[PDB]
């Protein structure tokens, strides 16, 4: 019995040592967990400070602009009214000199004609009364709302530097040397090449830059173009031949056709039409955020107020090229170009 | 000739004195004009500072709330993980004591059973592994937009203290003692009195307070009430008998009828219907600003995001009572009350 216990005791000692090692590993895990919680709280504070500081720097920029405009208009008004005051003071000094000369028989008769002529000239040279016109921008109760809508365009990041690929371009379309303007050519196009990257039948161009992650925003000036489409195309999605404008094939579109109808190309038998704004879209900004997987099309005709049109909410694959369907030229009826707005 | 000139000279002196007095008056006008321009620039700076400081104090309040929540969750996590660390340290100390006891024939055999039993109890009392769960609110790219919509409710002023008049109330309607709840009574109403202030046939109540000038905002919880109307009534507008819901008689309404249809009562043959939100309105805030003459009805179901419904833009007369058409009780089908939301 003693030998069995003496042989079993090292096994118990080894088990206790293993338990102590596991406890030490758990204590190290707990310490690193506490450190990581503190670092996560610091990072959350930093990120919320970044967002709210973007809001604060927009507000400070607007306040500085308004204060500078008020200072400039006050300076101009002060300069003009001081010119008027100096002219009035000169006229008053001349009138006082004329009165002093009139206060001072032969010499009086000799000087009376000159004094009367100078007084008549001074009276006829009377400047017109000044006008109380100050044209600083007035701020009513609505003004804060005018700021609030104005905040939206400021919230979105800087316009993504996008350029048009000549290689992926449809053969009819010609891309300008700057890379921000594409338009259809009335002349006959060359036959489509064997390169699968360029579009065969869908008359469209995709931008050069490759959106990968994070928030992105880019604006397209459409003008008064009759029919077009703006959106994103999946990199794995095929391009040769006609393309179904559905998220399932890999196209997220906001195709407008026949001038008035603005239909968002959602998965269905037919792209369901949205409601047209009271004035036609001339400049539309696409906002793609990969973190929440949203793609929103904001009508930006006035840079102050951006009104939403449609927002896809499904998760987006990486990477999606921005996509611009300029469509057929239609014997000059659709010659209006889609141009990227650059900062 | 000399006598005529000598007699005419005082007339010229008096004319010069009058011209000098006019010039002095003009100089005083110019000086006061410059002072008033400087004061107007100071007042414009003060007003824009007030609006942008309202925005900044909302942003600072949100930042303080988020920072306080982060600090509280860090403190709770630290307390819990320190409890776990203390338990692990106690277990490690017990294991070290057991190992030291095992390191130290008759005495060893006597103590071996107790040491083995204590080691087995310590091994069986092993705490489960900790879980890395921190529930601070995560902020994605969308979070700033979540702030921006949240700014709207913060931009509007505090909820106007409004109470229901029992005297102007329709005879069927009963107003609670607090003054923020009105509902129809199933019992038969007394005959309408000769007082012209209360409504004869239009089943409605107007609030006690008299809006005079400036921005004002007040919220009504409608619940799931089938038919009602919210708006403003001109003080000069007659109330006895049926009232045409038009701005020309003096009623600005957002009457909802038959549950789904939400029609803004604009001047026409028929009140033109708006578009219904995807979920029914349960709480609607009216915003009246006399400076720009706007009356806007914002659907406020979530206090963060307020979506506009309709905005009258015509100039409003002073003073307009807020107006609440609770309509006929309809044998218990329309017994749901309209209650004013109070801060």
From Swiss-Prot, chains A, B:
Effect recorded for residue 148 to A/E: Disrupts membrane translocation. Reduced cell viability upon peroxide and saponin treatment
Reactions catalysed, as given in the entry: S-ubiquitinyl-[E2 ubiquitin-conjugating enzyme]-L-cysteine + [acceptor protein]-L-lysine = [E2 ubiquitin-conjugating enzyme]-L-cysteine + N(6)-ubiquitinyl-[acceptor protein]-L-lysine
Pathway of action: Protein modification; protein ubiquitination
One Gene Ontology term of the molecular function aspect: phosphatidylserine binding
Phenotype upon changing residue 66 to A: Monomeric; fails to translocate to membrane; reduced cell viability upon peroxide and saponin treatment
Keywords per UniProt: Cell membrane, Coiled coil, Cytoplasmic vesicle, Disulfide bond, Exocytosis, Membrane, Metal-binding, Phosphoprotein, S-nitrosylation, Transferase, Transport, Ubl conjugation pathway, Zinc, Zinc-finger
Domain B30.2/SPRY stretches: 142-343
Activity regulation info: Specifically binds phosphatidylserine. The binding to phospholipids enhances ubiquitination activity.
UniProt-listed GO biological process terms: exocytosis; innate immune response; muscle organ development; muscle system process; negative regulation of insulin receptor signaling pathway; negative regulation of insulin-like growth factor receptor signaling pathway; negative regulation of myotube differentiation; plasma membrane repair
Effect annotated for changing residue 62 to A: Monomeric; fails to translocate to membrane; reduced cell viability upon peroxide and saponin treatment
PTM: Disulfide bond formation at Cys-113 occurs in case of membrane damage that cause the entry of the oxidized milieu of the extracellular space, resulting in homooligomerization. S-nitrosylation at Cys-20 stabilizes TRIM72 and protects against oxidation-induced protein degradation and cell death.
Mutation effect (residue 45 to A): Reduced cell viability upon peroxide and saponin treatment. Reduced affinity for phospho-L-serine; fails to translocate to membrane and reduced cell viability upon peroxide and saponin treatment
Coiled-coil boundaries: 11-104
Record family assignment: Belongs to the TRIM/RBCC family.
Subunit description: Homodimer. Homooligomer; disulfide-linked. Oligomerizes on the phospholipid membrane. Interacts with DYSF and CAV3.
Entry note about domains: The RING domain is flexible in both the dimer and oligomer. Binding to the negatively charged phosphatidylserine lipids is mediated by the positively charged PRYSPRY domains and is inhibited by Ca(2+).
Record-given protein name: Tripartite motif-containing protein 72
Organism listed in the record: Homo sapiens
